[PDB]
C-alpha cells in the first residue's frame, strides 16, 4: 500500500512434497528509499499579496508546505513552478527545495501551477491557482460569521448567493490580527457550508477569517470579518 | 532573599543592591534614587502599546526635550486583569521602541508604565491601561 | 444548579430537558433548544 516505507522481508523454504522441515527465515532484507514513481499529487499552495492598492504591480509570495509521505511518495528533489499567462505563454522556474517563492503579478490573468519533481519526473495531479483582476471583484459570499467552538476548533460558516460562475472550492484563510502569525490556510470543497478548523485558537483574540471563493476564472472577492460574531 | 521592604521617608533616598561572595562585593552595581521632586517630572509626551503577537509587544514613546540627563528607561508591565507579578526590564535611553518578549494575551488589559530614570531619580511615569486601537 | 461533565460544543443546539421525578411518576419536562444569551 505504501511504496516508500521500508519493508522487512524474510523468506523460508520447504520441500514441495511436504517431506521435510522448513528452513530458518533468511536474514531480513530492507528496501532502500529511492523514488519509485513520480509524486502522486502536487503541493497545496496559497499566496500572500504584498502591494499598495495604487500600484499596478503586486508582489505575490507563494507559500506551500513540504509534501507528506502519502503525496510525495518517497522524495522531492526540487520544486518547479509552471507559470501560464495570456501574453508570455508558459514558462517554468526551478525553485529547488525552497518552500516559498515570490513573483511579480503584472498581467490581467496569471495562472500558476506548482510541480513536484523527483528522480523519475514531475507530479501527475497538480493544483493550479488563477490570479485575475476582474475576478477579484466577484462576491458570492452573502454573509460570513465566525464563532470559536473551543481552543482547538472554530466553525466558520457562510451563506452563498447564486452565481453564474462555477465555484470550484473554498479556501478559508485565518490569521491573528493581534499576532504576526504565519498565514494559515486550508482548501475546502465547494460543497461544504460549515467547517471545523483544527488549530490552536484563543477565542478572545481578534482573528481575521477570510473566505476566498475560488473559481475557474480565478479568486473571487473575499468576505472578511475581524471579530467573532456575538449574536 | 530576593525581596526587601524598607520605609522611604526622606526627600531623596538612593539605594544600591550589592552582591557579595566569599571574596567580596560586586564591582559594578546598579543604583536607583527615590526623589519626591523628580516623581513630578514628565518627559514622555505620548505612550502607546500595541500587541504584536502573543510573545511580543512593541511599546513606543515620543520624548519631549528635557533639561535633566535621562540615563535609561524602564518599561514596567502588568496585567490589570491578573494579580500578575510585576515584570520589568531596564532599557537604554537611546531606545524609542522595544520588543518585550513575554507571554502577552492581546485582549487582556495590561498596564504599561514607562518610567524615565534620571540621575536625580525616577520621573513621572506615563501610563496607559489599554492597547491603542488607532 | 449542576455541573454536567461531558464534551459540549457551545454553539451547537443542545436540548436540555429537566424532568421532575415524583413518587407518582415523571412530571412534565421544561425544555429549551438554545443557550440563553441574556
Swiss-Prot record, chain B:
Consequence the record notes for mutating residue 89 to P: In LEPRD; uncertain significance
PTM comment: the record says: On ligand binding, phosphorylated on two conserved C-terminal tyrosine residues (isoform B only) by JAK2.
Where in the cell?
Cell membrane; Basolateral cell membrane
According to the entry, every stretch annotated as the Fibronectin type-III domain falls at 43-134
Q: Tissue range of expression?
A: Isoform A is expressed in fetal liver and in hematopoietic tissues and choroid plexus. In adults highest expression in heart, liver, small intestine, prostate and ovary. Low level in lung and kidney. Isoform B is highly expressed in hypothalamus, but also in skeletal muscle. Detected in fundic and antral epithelial cells of the gastric mucosa. Isoform B and isoform A are expressed by NK cells (at protein level).
Domain description: The cytoplasmic domain may be essential for intracellular signal transduction by activation of JAK tyrosine kinase and STATs. The WSXWS motif appears to be necessary for proper protein folding and thereby efficient intracellular transport and cell-surface receptor binding.
What's the subunit arrangement here?
Present as a mixture of monomers and dimers. The phosphorylated receptor binds a number of SH2 domain-containing proteins such as JAK2, STAT3, PTPN11, and SOCS3. Interaction with SOCS3 inhibits JAK/STAT signaling and MAPK cascade.
Family, per the entry? Answer: Belongs to the type I cytokine receptor family. Type 2 subfamily.
Function, in words: Receptor for hormone LEP/leptin. On ligand binding, mediates LEP central and peripheral effects through the activation of different signaling pathways such as JAK2/STAT3 and MAPK cascade/FOS. In the hypothalamus, LEP acts as an appetite-regulating factor that induces a decrease in food intake and an increase in energy consumption by inducing anorexinogenic factors and suppressing orexigenic neuropeptides, also regulates bone mass and secretion of hypothalamo-pituitary-adrenal hormones.
How is this protein named in the record? Leptin receptor
Give the species.
Homo sapiens (Human)
Query: Where the shown chain sits in the full protein?
Result: 698 to 831 of 1165
Curated annotation (Swiss-Prot), chain C:
- Please give the tissue specificity annotation from the record for this chain: Isoform A is expressed in fetal liver and in hematopoietic tissues and choroid plexus. In adults highest expression in heart, liver, small intestine, prostate and ovary. Low level in lung and kidney. Isoform B is highly expressed in hypothalamus, but also in skeletal muscle. Detected in fundic and antral epithelial cells of the gastric mucosa. Isoform B and isoform A are expressed by NK cells (at protein level).
Localization per record: Cell membrane; Basolateral cell membrane
Task: Provide the record's note on post-translational modification.
Answer: On ligand binding, phosphorylated on two conserved C-terminal tyrosine residues (isoform B only) by JAK2.
- Top-level taxon of origin: Eukaryota
Q: What disease is mentioned for this protein?
A: Leptin receptor deficiency: A rare disease characterized by normal levels of serum leptin, hyperphagia and severe obesity from an early age. Additional features include alterations in immune function, and delayed puberty due to hypogonadotropic hypogonadism.
What does the UniProt entry state concerning the protein's domains? The cytoplasmic domain may be essential for intracellular signal transduction by activation of JAK tyrosine kinase and STATs.
Q: What does this protein do?
A: Receptor for hormone LEP/leptin. On ligand binding, mediates LEP central and peripheral effects through the activation of different signaling pathways such as JAK2/STAT3 and MAPK cascade/FOS. In the hypothalamus, LEP acts as an appetite-regulating factor that induces a decrease in food intake and an increase in energy consumption by inducing anorexinogenic factors and suppressing orexigenic neuropeptides, also regulates bone mass and secretion of hypothalamo-pituitary-adrenal hormones.
Q: Which family does it belong to?
A: Belongs to the type I cytokine receptor family. Type 2 subfamily.
Subunit note: Present as a mixture of monomers and dimers. The phosphorylated receptor binds a number of SH2 domain-containing proteins such as JAK2, STAT3, PTPN11, and SOCS3. Interaction with SOCS3 inhibits JAK/STAT signaling and MAPK cascade.
- Write the protein's name: Leptin receptor
Q: What is the lineage of its organism?
A: Eukaryota, Metazoa, Chordata, Craniata, Vertebrata
What gene name does this entry carry?
Answer: LEPR
Which region of the full protein is contained in this chain?
A: 794 to 831 of 1165
Amino acid at each position: 500500500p505504501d511504496l516508500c516505507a521500508v519493508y522487512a522481508v524474510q523468506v523460508r523454504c520447504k520441500r514441495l512434497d511436504g517431506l521435510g522441515y522448513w528452513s530458518n527465515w533468511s536474514n531480513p532484507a530492507y528496501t532502500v528509499v529511492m523514488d519509485i514513481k513520480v509524486p502522486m499529487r502536487g503541493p497545496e499552495f496559497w499566496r500572500i499579496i504584498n502591494g499598495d492598492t495604487m500600484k499596478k504591480e503586486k508582489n505575490v509570495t507563494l507559500l506551500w508546505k513540504p509534501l507528506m509521505k502519502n503525496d510525495s511518495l518517497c522524495s522531492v528533489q526540487r520544486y518547479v513552478i509552471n507559470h501560464h499567462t495570456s501574453c508570455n505563454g508558459t514558462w517554468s522556474e526551478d525553485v529547488g527545495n525552497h518552500t516559498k517563492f515570490t513573483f511579480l503579478w503584472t498581467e490581467q490573468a496569471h495562472t500558476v501551477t506548482v510541480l513536484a519533481i523527483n528522480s523519475i519526473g514531475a507530479s501527475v495531479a497538480n493544483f493550479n491557482l488563477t490570479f485575475s483582476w476582474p475576478m477579484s471583484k466577484v462576491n458570492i459570499v452573502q454573509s460570513l460569521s465566525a464563532y470559536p467552538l473551543n481552543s482547538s476548533c472554530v466553525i466558520v460558516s457562510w451563506i452563498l448567493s447564486p452565481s453564474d460562475y462555477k465555484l470550484m472550492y473554498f479556501i478559508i484563510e485565518w490569521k491573528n490580527l493581534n499576532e504576526d502569525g504565519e498565514i494559515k490556510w486550508l482548501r475546502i470543497s465547494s460543497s461544504v457550508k460549515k467547517y471545523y478548523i483544527h488549530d490552536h485558537f484563543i477565542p478572545i483574540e481578534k482573528y481575521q477569517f477570510s473566505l476566498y471563493p475560488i473559481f475557474m476564472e480565478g479568486v473571487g472577492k473575499p468576505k472578511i470579518i475581524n471579530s467573532f460574531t456575538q449574536d
